[PDB]
Amino acid sequence: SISVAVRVRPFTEAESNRLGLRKIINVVDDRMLIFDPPETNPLTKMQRNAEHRFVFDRLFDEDCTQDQVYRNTTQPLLDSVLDGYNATVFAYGATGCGKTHTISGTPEDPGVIFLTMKELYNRIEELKDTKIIDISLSYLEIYNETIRDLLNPMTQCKNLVIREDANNKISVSNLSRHRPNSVEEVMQLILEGNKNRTCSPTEANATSSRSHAVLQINVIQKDRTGDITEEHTFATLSIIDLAGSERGANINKSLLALGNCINALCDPRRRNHVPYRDSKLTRLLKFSLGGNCKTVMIVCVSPSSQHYDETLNTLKYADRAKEIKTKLIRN
Ligand SMILES: Nc1ncnc2c1ncn2[C@@H]1O[C@H](COP(=O)(O)OP(=O)(O)O)[C@@H](O)[C@H]1O
Ligand SMILES: [Mg+2]
């Protein structure tokens, strides 16, 4: 049960000033776009006579708002999370296409993490009469199959081990957890943590395109009007700003393994043989992908014709997150 959305980042000012470029995607409606689309002036098309069609669960064009992306991706998940089920939201795509803008955003235009925390704080506050709710978050990096605490950068990578604990809960040893008293501090914590991500080998103040950033929100709740019990619910909402998708084995082991696991989940014959074990990222999300965990991937693409190749790749990647139409072969 994997949901795929596409978000086309807007042009920059120079990009729009060179329109030599041309818009390589036409967002027809809320569910279908056209890649490499035909030429929109009837006369000009007639002169040219002298494309790929894509349907996804939800489309966001250059001018969509952060609130529009949030309400149509992760807000519908919150109920699951408060009912005790895990939920997961990815930002996939090539570097420069708006992954970090969508997940983290800016203090002026906050992204999915921020708005998720805002709505969750409100929800906690409304159901305070009947529920005891503990809300906490952590924010880690997977780079070159090494785990770093983006909110406690002084803990040694070897001390951050993925543990499958009791029940069916994946955890990370010695990973710090934080209870921001407010939304302002949620954003502060996002920004500091992003500042802690691995630098690009090239220039500076440049997060490496190979950095996975995994935010995790742990929601635990318990009945307040019953008697003293051990019944609780405990769910994890994972919001991931993935490494860049553009073209040692451990550099992009996690990205490739996420791809392979999505393949397996979309194929009914191998959906029970998902290779979560093949990387840090997929191991961390062993109980945070399959049908059980509501999973939505936000594919982020560039409208610029300059990015034809990568964008097409990305779209085709999104296109193969669709369930395979198998046949019930007999004998
Ligand atoms: N929807 C958007 N609206 C305005 N600016 C955007 C949008 N998406 C991306 N940007 C800008 O484009 C640049 C690249 O975005 P970023 O999120 O860093 O891409 P990625 O994280 O995929 O490398 C950033 O400076 C960001 O501010
Ligand atoms: Mg980024």
Author numbering: 25 to 43, 101 to 131, 143 to 339, 353 to 436
Paper text:
The electron density from the CaKip3-MDN-ADP crystal allowed us to model residues Phe116 to Ala131 of loop-2, which includes a proline-rich region and a ~10-residue helical sequence that is shared by some kinesin-8s.
The pathogenic yeast Candida albicans expresses a single kinesin-8 homolog, dubbed CaKip3, whose motor domain shares 60% sequence identity with that of S. cerevisiae Kip3.
